[PDB]
Amino acid sequence: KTRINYAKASPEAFKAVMALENYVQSSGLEHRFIHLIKLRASIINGCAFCVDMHVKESRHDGLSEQWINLMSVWRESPVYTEQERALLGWVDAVTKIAETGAPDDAFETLRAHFSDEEIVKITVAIGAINTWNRIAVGFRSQHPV
Amino acid sequence: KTRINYAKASPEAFKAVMALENYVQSSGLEHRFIHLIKLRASIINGCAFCVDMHVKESRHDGLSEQWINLMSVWRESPVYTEQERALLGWVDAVTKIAETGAPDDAFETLRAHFSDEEIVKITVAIGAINTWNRIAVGFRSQHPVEA
């Protein structure tokens, strides 16, 4: 069902995206926040390949099944902390940038909880997962069953 | 914070929705399809109260964590059988009836995998969860948070 084996067709292009990924992982952001960014953006973008991966990674790091399962419907779930909600609002707004334009309210709420350095790391992370989602959905990557 | 305790505010209205729910549960549809309908519609509708409930019920009935977790992004997931995909296409179209109008392609794909009787049961089940989602989101029902 896969369209292109992208890692084989252009190894260097793949490695360039992976370099950005490796930066994200080592950026200093709490792993919990990285998991959240990756899982939530992948849900918005319909990327089963990435959702499968990030569910597994979140579980391995001890995040609860509720935290994982409710991520698709976070706005109405009391699971998430105020800081997590601030982050999720930004993940949503920025993932859907063409629609939302990244509103003042979402940014202000994020600023209450994070430094500008952290916000840059968060936003680069959102960009990175948005790239993987585009590659994986675009090329119909198939997750393991 | 909850807006209204609807079971208290109107016991009779609550009972009426519970009667429809009771019909769906005893309708004859495979449990697996009932869980799928309820979980997928709840995700589309943004209903955390129902998603929490239906994840838990799905788990109780032995559905895998992958089947549960991937429901939000089923189109791109190889987890679901062709029959499940037919059902999911219909849950999606019918939950979003105003936008999709329930197209011939989604209906024809469903008809390939289910009898007309089953299709009526499925469609009533979709209506039922759409009602619960509207009640729960509308009244800001709060799901339990685990320890």
Add this chain to the structure above:
Amino acid sequence: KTRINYAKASPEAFKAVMALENYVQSSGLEHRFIHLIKLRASIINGCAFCVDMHVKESRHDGLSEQWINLMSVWRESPVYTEQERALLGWVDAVTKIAETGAPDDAFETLRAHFSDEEIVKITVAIGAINTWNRIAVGFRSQHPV
């Protein structure tokens, strides 16, 4: 043409939906509000089968042609009372729950004109017509001409 004669294919399922309909009818909500709920939701949902029925029902109960004809465009019509506008805002938000998430403003406006008991009955009624619309559009039910 009709996809499925649903009352014939599953009499028990049809009976269950009619049971809910029967509750709504006897719920004690003013019938003017039941008509409004049914007509407006059916318009939003594109359900000609139900619009045809509820137009005729509204007329039978002596609601004016303007009240009926303007329901598709109520926001800009001075026909509707403040209480009706509060109800219409809720019908719209709840019918489009996936888009709107039933906002605070719509809820508080509704609370200003209806008791909590009435609000529960209203919201169950919105659910009920949303079910009928899904069945009728879903099975391509044909209204009489």
Add this chain to the structure above:
Amino acid sequence: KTRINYAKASPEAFKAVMALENYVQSSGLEHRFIHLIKLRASIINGCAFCVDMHVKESRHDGLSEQWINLMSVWRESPVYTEQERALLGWVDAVTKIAETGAPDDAFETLRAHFSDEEIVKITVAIGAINTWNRIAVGFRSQHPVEA
């Protein structure tokens, strides 16, 4: 409350739109089609001022209450002829031009039932009502209310 009395604020601009309206009216298009175009576009655009007007005009020319009331939901209504359906598809596509881009299928179906000359008349008529809708909604024009 009305925002601007536009006829008073700029009589010249008002007259210019009225001249286009006069063209549409005497264009040769069947009055039933003119009514249909005006009523349907007005519903899409949320223009109560124009819907009120065009409901009354349609009624005056003997169109049925069903024809009038089902226009908001025409796709699922058997009241409309195949020709009317072809026209309605185009009214919808062109009224929502930014979303649809006026697709080949909608144009092909229209072409089945109308000459190129008629299509130009139709499309100018769609443009004209789209202008009135923007003026009326834009300036919050208030329709009369019958007791």
Add this chain to the structure above:
Amino acid sequence: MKTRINYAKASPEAFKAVMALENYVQSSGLEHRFIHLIKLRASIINGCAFCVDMHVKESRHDGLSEQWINLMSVWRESPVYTEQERALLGWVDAVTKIAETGAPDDAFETLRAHFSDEEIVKITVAIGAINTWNRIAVGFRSQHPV
């Protein structure tokens, strides 16, 4: 070809009627800068390459900068536009997308801060006019010169 209908040939009378409204707008007294802005922005929203091509050329002829022309597709985030131009653009966007927005109070009041009621009527008729051209040109797949 790529064109569906040669509309000026198929109905000269209908063409003349739309041109008459266009000729009103041109003569209306609105600053030509604002006329260009209304036409260019609405055409972009509506996906009308036929009109975008024409109105880019007209704007350039009247001495509007390449930035002013090119950033019109993404004006909300561009410091190019004056506060008055932004007020107008907000209204062009809201009214062009009337079915979605309903022409909100905020957009109207902001416009009111920069234009007289008479000017607002001329502006709104102008938005109507371009919205008509866009529907004709996209509808008929009119092809701009290359």
Add this chain to the structure above:
Amino acid sequence: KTRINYAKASPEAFKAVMALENYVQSSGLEHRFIHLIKLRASIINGCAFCVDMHVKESRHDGLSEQWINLMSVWRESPVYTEQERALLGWVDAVTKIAETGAPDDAFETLRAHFSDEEIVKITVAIGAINTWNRIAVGFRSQHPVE
């Protein structure tokens, strides 16, 4: 007007995004296609900061004002070659991945005009500009005004 000077707030994160950018620039794709990808995606995403930049880069590389100005409305413009149209359909589908899910028809059309290797470079380039647009709109970056 600016929310965050991202290069100053996190030099390390900036360097990481620049590394991906430097790959794209030297990927071997024809610069015309790189400009097209960057300009179109930026228009879709409402990013004035990137549109301003990519308009200027396209002009420097000799692309016509028509090719630049019509990108916002490409579907209806005869300026673009069939190969460019194939690419544009993919840029649009993938930029709006949540809405479109990258359909078979768009992919097959792209395949008719580009090798699998090129398609990978193209899609990475789409991801890259989508990241820049999120950063610039997200942080309200302000482009220079001439």
